[PDB]
Amino acid sequence: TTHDIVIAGGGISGLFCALRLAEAGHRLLVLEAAADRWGGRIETEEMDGFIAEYGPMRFEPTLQPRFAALCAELGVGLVDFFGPSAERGLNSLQLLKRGIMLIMGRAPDDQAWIDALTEADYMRLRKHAQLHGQPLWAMGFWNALSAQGILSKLRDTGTFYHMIPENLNAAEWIIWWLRALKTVGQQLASIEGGSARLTAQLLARLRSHANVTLAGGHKLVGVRPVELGKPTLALDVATQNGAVTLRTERLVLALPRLPLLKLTRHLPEHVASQLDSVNGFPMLKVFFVCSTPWWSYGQAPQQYANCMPTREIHYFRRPPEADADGHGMVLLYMDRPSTEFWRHYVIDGDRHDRAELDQNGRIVDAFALFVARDVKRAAASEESALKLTDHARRIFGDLSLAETTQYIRNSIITYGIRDWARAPYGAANHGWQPGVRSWKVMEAFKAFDFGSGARNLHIVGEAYSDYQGFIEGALNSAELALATIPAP
Amino acid sequence: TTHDIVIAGGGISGLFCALRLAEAGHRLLVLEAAADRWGGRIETEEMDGFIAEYGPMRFEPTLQPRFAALCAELGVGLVDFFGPSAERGLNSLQLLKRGIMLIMGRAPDDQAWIDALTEADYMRLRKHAQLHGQPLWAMGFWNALSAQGILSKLRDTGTFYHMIPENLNAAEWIIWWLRALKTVGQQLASIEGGSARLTAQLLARLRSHANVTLAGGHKLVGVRPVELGKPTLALDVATQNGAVTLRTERLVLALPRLPLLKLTRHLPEHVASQLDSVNGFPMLKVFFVCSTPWWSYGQAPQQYNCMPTREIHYFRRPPEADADGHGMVLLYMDRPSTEFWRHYVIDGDRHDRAELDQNGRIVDAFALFVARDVKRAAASEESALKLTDHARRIFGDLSLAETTQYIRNSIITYGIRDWARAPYGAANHGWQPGVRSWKVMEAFKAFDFGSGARNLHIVGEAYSDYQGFIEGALNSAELALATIPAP
Ligand SMILES: Cc1cc2nc3c(=O)[nH]c(=O)nc-3n(C[C@H](O)[C@H](O)[C@@H](O)COP(=O)(O)OP(=O)(O)OC[C@H]3O[C@@H](n4cnc5c(N)ncnc54)[C@@H](O)[C@@H]3O)c2cc1C
Numbered sequence A: 001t002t003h004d005i006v007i008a009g010g011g012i013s014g015l016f017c018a019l020r021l022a023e024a025g026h027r028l029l030v031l032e033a034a035a036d037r038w039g040g041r042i043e044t045e046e047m048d049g050f051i052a053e054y055g056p057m058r059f060e061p062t063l064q065p066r067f068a069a070l071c072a073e074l075g076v077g078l079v080d081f082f083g084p085s086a087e088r089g090l091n092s093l094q095l096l097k098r099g100i101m102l103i104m105g106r107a108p109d110d111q112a113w114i115d116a117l118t119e120a121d122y123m124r125l126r127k128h129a130q131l132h133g134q135p136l137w138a139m140g141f142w143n144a145l146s147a148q149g150i151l152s153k154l155r156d157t158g159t160f161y162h163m164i165p166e167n168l169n170a171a172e173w174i175i176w177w178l179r180a181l182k183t184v185g186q187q188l189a190s191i192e193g194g195s196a197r198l199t200a201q202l203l204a205r206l207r208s209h210a211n212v213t214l215a216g217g218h219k220l221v222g223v224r225p226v227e228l229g230k231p232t233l234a235l236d237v238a239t240q241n242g243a244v245t246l247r248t249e250r251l252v253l254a255l256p257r258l259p260l261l262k263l264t265r266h267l268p269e270h271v272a273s274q275l276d277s278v279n280g281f282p283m284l285k286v287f288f289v290c291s292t293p294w295w296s297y298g299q300a301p302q303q304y305a306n307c308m309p310t311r312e313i314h315y316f317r318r319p320p321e322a323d324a325d326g327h328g329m330v331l332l333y334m335d336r337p338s339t340e341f342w343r344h345y346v347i348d349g350d351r352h353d354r355a356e357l358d359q360n361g362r363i364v365d366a367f368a369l370f371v372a373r374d375v376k377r378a379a380a381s382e383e384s385a386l387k388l389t390d391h392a393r394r395i396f397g398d399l400s401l402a403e404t405t406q407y408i409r410n411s412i413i414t415y416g417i418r419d420w421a422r423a424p425y426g427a428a429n430h431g432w433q434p435g436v437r438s439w440k441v442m443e444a445f446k447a448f449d450f451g452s453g454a455r456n457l458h459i460v461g462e463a464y465s466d467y468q469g470f471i472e473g474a475l476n477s478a479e480l481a482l483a484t485i486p487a488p
Numbered sequence B: 001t002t003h004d005i006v007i008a009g010g011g012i013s014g015l016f017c018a019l020r021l022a023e024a025g026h027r028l029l030v031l032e033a034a035a036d037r038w039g040g041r042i043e044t045e046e047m048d049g050f051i052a053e054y055g056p057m058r059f060e061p062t063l064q065p066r067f068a069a070l071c072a073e074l075g076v077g078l079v080d081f082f083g084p085s086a087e088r089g090l091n092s093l094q095l096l097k098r099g100i101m102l103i104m105g106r107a108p109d110d111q112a113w114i115d116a117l118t119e120a121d122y123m124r125l126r127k128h129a130q131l132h133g134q135p136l137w138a139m140g141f142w143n144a145l146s147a148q149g150i151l152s153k154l155r156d157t158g159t160f161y162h163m164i165p166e167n168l169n170a171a172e173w174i175i176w177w178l179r180a181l182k183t184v185g186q187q188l189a190s191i192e193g194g195s196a197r198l199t200a201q202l203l204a205r206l207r208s209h210a211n212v213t214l215a216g217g218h219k220l221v222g223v224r225p226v227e228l229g230k231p232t233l234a235l236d237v238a239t240q241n242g243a244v245t246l247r248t249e250r251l252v253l254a255l256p257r258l259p260l261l262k263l264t265r266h267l268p269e270h271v272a273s274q275l276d277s278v279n280g281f282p283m284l285k286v287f288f289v290c291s292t293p294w295w296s297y298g299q300a301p302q303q304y305n306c307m308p309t310r311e312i313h314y315f316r317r318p319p320e321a322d323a324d325g326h327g328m329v330l331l332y333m334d335r336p337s338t339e340f341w342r343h344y345v346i347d348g349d350r351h352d353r354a355e356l357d358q359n360g361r362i363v364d365a366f367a368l369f370v371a372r373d374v375k376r377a378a379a380s381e382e383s384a385l386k387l388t389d390h391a392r393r394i395f396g397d398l399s400l401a402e403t404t405q406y407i408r409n410s411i412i413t414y415g416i417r418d419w420a421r422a423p424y425g426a427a428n429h430g431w432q433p434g435v436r437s438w439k440v441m442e443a444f445k446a447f448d449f450g451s452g453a454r455n456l457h458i459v460g461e462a463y464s465d466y467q468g469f470i471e472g473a474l475n476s477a478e479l480a481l482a483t484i485p486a487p
């Protein structure tokens, strides 16, 4: 065949491009490597009636305006989330804010200065802000915080996801934190009836657009200019059937770093040379649904780290105004190196493009043992962070740990695991690297070509965005490229 | 041109192949991507008269017989090393041995069983040893230790490089540790006048062998069979001049995982599909040479959080030859400390050896980190810091900003090697859960593009049966040697 515009990748950014480009009236095609699914890192499975987000769960719409706007324009609402909470002059909580504000030269409690910062200011910071003579775009976040007259000590033990041991671009993670440290963005909200709800609504308005053919099961595996000097692109697309060959005047790669690296030979050196301007962090989620929970409503998230190979362990029960069975659900949410523990419980090598539910008992076998220890210890202490129901407090007192194991192992109705470090994602999210001038990459990536000046290839997505980690970045990224695509 | 046998890679295994193949009488050529140097991961720089090993330092010749033998046959001596030292029935140092011996079903004090274990036994372990129904070749080391009736909890926050958070092949790291846990070893030896001494001696006997042309500055960047079905190989070799094109009847890839992955398109799928059967661990060394040390004459290596490092090792001159009283500090670190320091290599693009005295910012940050710890060590005294009386006092009095500067000034020369960098991509490698090592080593020892020619080979530590050590690199060389007939 032949098409005006191909879009490789049907993730949030792939599709926000497939929308705005339809609304200006182009003949779009959306290749998407996955047969049945759409929205990539957006994953919401229903597990014994619980909404289990294998991908994003909450959002800060005040911070992520363009998210709200794609939510609004699509009829997606946001149920505000009200869920549970959690060496001298250096005596506070988290408050890397001290570290940042020292670097920026302000008072370590100058929260007005922080709340007044614009994107325009963030750009001025990233380009021009220095620390001990060095630009911050050239430094580790970890190094800038450890400098003469900053911190140390540095607690990665404790804290949320600040990517200290990954040592990201100082400027870009000073920027990122100065954002989430504004007074707003405490407004925390789920998406009504799942996060994948947003995927659906975007296809339901992307079906009522005539000039859009959505083509699941299609994976871009090649790109050549047809003739030297000319803008016509040859796309090798492998699919279910077999190895088709599309042609287009404009290809949009809505792909994170790992797919792009698998395409690296088929890309201009000047672009392919920079795909390593970001690192993909792995994250891994495990969900267990328990018949007979040991925790009440409002049991706080813990930071198990030791007790379990996990970072966070999150706790869910059905609303107390329902509870048709009284069941509950546990999220093990983990980064490096806990990810390496669980990685190996995906039974299918070769392919892992979505959660594996109820396919390895060994995942429960290891969840059981780890919790079994902790809930014999929590009965006694009572000053343990594990609330523990009266029913559970007693019955555990009596069972021989080896049986507390089995009680929990039996208790599991359904369980699932998503290892986001696996192809074709290779990461839950990405981070700029020390040395990188993000703005040089984002400009090069938004629009490029094989050497005609055609400006008819694009990269879009979170990975090389100005708001990494969030759908907002994926959206900012889509726009940057949209602006370089004229009407038909 | 055209050659009997090319050997890509002039590291220890590349060269032990270039030797034994000369001694059977082939017309060898050794390509080596590095212009000036040989022996790759073997790196020994002289720093204000100190032997600084950016690569291997010590060795266990009892455990590594084939190392001793290549040392002996080359006139390389080993100065035995006598350097400084270091919840219910679960309260010791090497609860690791507890964990292993639980898995293996023996008594956690069965040290005779351990000392009696042969290679043939290690193979039987690899292939057949199970845990809760699962073969260990299929498990994480971390998972096997955390099992019902083993450990937990697991202290990786202590300990010397056990690769728990890298979660390596349970069987292959049970094997690896059961080796270094023999009493037989622990006999620790440096190499006489540096570790790179062994590189030199191997070229000095590799010069007196007529049928060997050594070609530094040459990097294999492609391999095609000349004709479909026929054993003739086309080598694209980039060099100083430019892009020559050799031909050979037999190519030996003495290369770790990362260069082989850069050649992955030029390799048979059946081989390239398995290069990810191992992980390359990054390690990073920084060396500082200090005018006026702050530490005692037996100051133990520490396990520093306190610094972004894992080990911090302490050196003075043999004080029988100490003409200035100087001392040296080795920051030796794994993930994630590696990420802190890696950014202080001033040359992007290329890093094939240590960068000495090329970034003051490395001292600037060493100073501050130690400056804190040695103001705390003046007072507490309940510290591993054997601080000298001269140092204990003078530090008491100086402000941080001056304690930093005292140390910053004290530094004569400093260096950094980031082994995670091309073309090494790792200080050493580890088998992965799922892998049957023995299936990989058999596939790798000899293969071809489909003729049956059996005229390509992979050799080196990375896919060896003794990962981490030169012994593995040597075991690997042999496996392939055995499949190469005499001329
Ligand atoms: C920090 C550290 C500590 C160590 N400690 C010990 C120890 O205590 N005990 C011990 O026994 N061993 C130790 N070792 C082992 C050491 O790694 C040995 O040198 C050995 O493992 C190297 O095996 P190799 O032959 O694969 O060497 P390599 O150096 O990996 O050989 C590869 C060579 O090929 C080259 N090359 C790469 N690409 C190309 C190309 N395309 N064409 C041509 N040439 C190419 C160069 O990279 C290099 O010279 C240590 C290593 C390190 C780094």
Ligand SMILES: Cc1cc2nc3c(=O)[nH]c(=O)nc-3n(C[C@H](O)[C@H](O)[C@H](O)COP(=O)(O)OP(=O)(O)OC[C@H]3O[C@@H](n4cnc5c(N)ncnc54)[C@@H](O)[C@@H]3O)c2cc1C
Binding pocket: A008, A009, A010, A011, A012, A013, A014, A031, A032, A033, A034, A038, A039, A040, A041, A042, A054, A055, A056, A057, A058, A059, A064, A218, A219, A220, A221, A254, A255, A256, A259, A283, A420, A424, A425, A427, A428, A429, A460, A461, A462, A463, A469, A470, A471, A472, A474
């Ligand atoms: C653990 C986790 C936590 C998150 N937390 C938050 C959060 O707190 N707040 C927030 O706002 N967002 C969060 N997110 C969301 C994340 O920011 C976005 O979902 C994502 O980054 C944006 O999607 P994308 O379009 O950029 O890329 P992706 O969703 O990765 O899109 C890639 C798509 O390309 C496809 N594809 C098509 N053709 C090819 C091909 N040839 N090769 C490869 N792939 C191909 C598929 O791989 C895939 O569907 C989280 C995500 C995860 C996984």
